[PDB]
Write a protein that binds this ligand. Structure first.
Ligand SMILES: OC[C@H]1O[C@@H](O[C@H]2[C@H](O)[C@@H](F)[C@H](O)O[C@@H]2CO)[C@H](O)[C@@H](O)[C@@H]1O
Ligand SMILES: *[C@@H]1O[C@H](CO)[C@@H](O)[C@H](O)[C@H]1NC(C)=O
Ligand SMILES: [Zn+2]
Length: 440
């Protein structure tokens, strides 16, 4: 895609800290950028949309290449259009924002400079942040996660992408998403079909795969952390239902693990650990620590374990133990993942796509920090916060993931009932294991 000039692109500032062993930290002058899929796209030199609602203008966009040549991404009004505000070390995302149009959700990336994403290298480090999920109901997900995107959003690979990271190009994730309007400097008009339940979305013939470490997928009721490996760790364009992932005829048919190896304390058998008034009390801000432990204790070792700690009201809270017979421990390891998938009768493509070692291979490439707020047009967030599938019995291990009702989370309802839901991420810190909190 091209660069539009109607609206200048100015990235809101957001600081974050790099820490050393001992706990000393230095502040980085980061800034955030909205994903290109949220932007106004118009014909170069004009105001006519290339895409409107969930359909393309096929005169301007008769094929993927001509469309990329003819269509320009515009700058964003972060607060007024998208409900995105930042101050100091804090980022607030609102769910619905009405301007001339009704915007729903957002997806933001952390930048190093105005043309380049920040590339985090998490092996043998911990990533820590504060969050306020107290305004997130059933059916919404404030996500903070990492994907193996290119640092320049694909500019240097794809000359037909003139916009790059400055305009939030280059997204990919372990669902191999086909809802992206531009992938690899090509539009996705070919094969496009509108969503039956999202007036703003559709899918095209191309998808964008890469590995994904889900640090945080949460609302006030449930949370989960989940590595998703792929055969290739970095961005790859896939075609058609062979992409696999959510929204394909077979989520398991492609090169990425769509499910991941997850740890949700409630799903792992503790119903009183995370939630309103619980050990980790979602009625107020808390700190979330996530550690990427390697086999040899160095940054070039193989990923062996992912650990989780919380801090709230100054008390350090270790992750809850998984309580199911034969699925023990309080962290993610290969033995946990194998045992958990067996007990829960979930297809284990985690190992097929490389397991923790494969996840680590992605971590070693460098990964982009994503902060988002979304509702779920496939599964109504029930996989996170309810019984899933909704036909199954809550007494069966793996089915119950939170206390939300099985008829919660339908996007039309969420969008009607919770337009002023929001999430606040703040106080990001990265450094050696134990360096960001009162360890160990
Ligand atoms: O596609 C929705 C999310 O799925 C999450 O994986 C689920 C499955 O969908 C279930 F079938 C399975 O029993 O449990 C796993 C874990 O909750 C996936 O982790 C997430 O990335 C997807 O958005
Ligand atoms: C839930 O986790 C908390 C904190 O670790 C613990 O105090 C409580 O006993 C746990 N419940 C179960 C059923 O293990
Ligand atoms: Zn015109």
């Amino acid at each position: 895609q091209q660069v539009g000039t109607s609206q200048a692109e100015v990235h809101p500032s957001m600081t974050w800290q790099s820490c050393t062993a001992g706990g000393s930290c230095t502040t980085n002058n980061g800034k955030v950028v909205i994903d290109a899929n949220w932007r106004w796209v118009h014909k170069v030199g004009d105001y006519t949309n290339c895409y409107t609602g969930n359909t393309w203008d096929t005169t301007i966009c008769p094929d993927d290449a001509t469309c990329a040549s003819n269509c320009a991404l515009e700058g964003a009004n972060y607060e007024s259009t998208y409900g995105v505000t930042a101050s100091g070390n804090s980022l607030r995302l609102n769910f619905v924002t009405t301007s001339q149009q009704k915007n729903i959700g957002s997806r933001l990336y952390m930048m190093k400079d105005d043309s380049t994403y920040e590339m985090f290298k998490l092996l043998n480090q911990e990533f820590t942040f504060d969050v306020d999920v107290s305004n997130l109901p059933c059916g919404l997900n404030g996500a903070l996660y990492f994907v193996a995107m290119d640092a320049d959003g694909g500019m240097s690979k794809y000359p037909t992408n003139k916009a790059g990271a400055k305009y939030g190009t280059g997204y990919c994730d372990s669902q191999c998403p086909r809802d992206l309007k531009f992938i690899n400097g090509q539009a996705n008009v070919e094969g496009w079909q509108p969503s039956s339940n999202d007036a703003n979305a559709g899918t095209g013939n191309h998808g964008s795969c890469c590995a994904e470490m889900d640090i945080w997928e949460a609302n006030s009721i449930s949370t989960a952390f989940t590595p998703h490996p792929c055969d290739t760790p970095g961005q790859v364009m896939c075609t058609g239902d062979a992409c696999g992932g959510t929204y394909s005829s077979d989520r398991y048919g492609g090169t990425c693990d769509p499910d991941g190896c997850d740890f949700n304390s409630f799903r792992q058998g503790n119903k009183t650990f995370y939630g309103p008034g619980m050990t980790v009390d979602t009625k107020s801000k808390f700190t979330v620590v996530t550690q990427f432990i390697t086999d040899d204790g160095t940054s070039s070792g193989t990923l062996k374990e992912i650990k989780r700690f919380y801090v709230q009201n100054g008390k350090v809270i270790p992750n809850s133990e998984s309580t199911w017979t034969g699925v023990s421990g309080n962290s993610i390891t290969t033995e946990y993942c194998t045992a958990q998938k067996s007990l829960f009768q979930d297809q284990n493509v985690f190992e097929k796509h490389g397991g923790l070692e494969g996840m680590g291979a992605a971590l070693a490439q460098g990964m982009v920090l994503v902060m988002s707020l979304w509702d779920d047009h496939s599964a109504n967030m029930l996989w996170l916060d309810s019984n899933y599938p909704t036909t199954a019995s809550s007494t069966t291990p793996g089915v119950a993931r939170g206390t939300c009702d099985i008829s919660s989370g339908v996007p039309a309802d969420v969008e009607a009932n919770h337009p002023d839901a929001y999430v606040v991420y703040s106080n990001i810190k990265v450094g050696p294991i134990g360096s960001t909190f009162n360890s160990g």
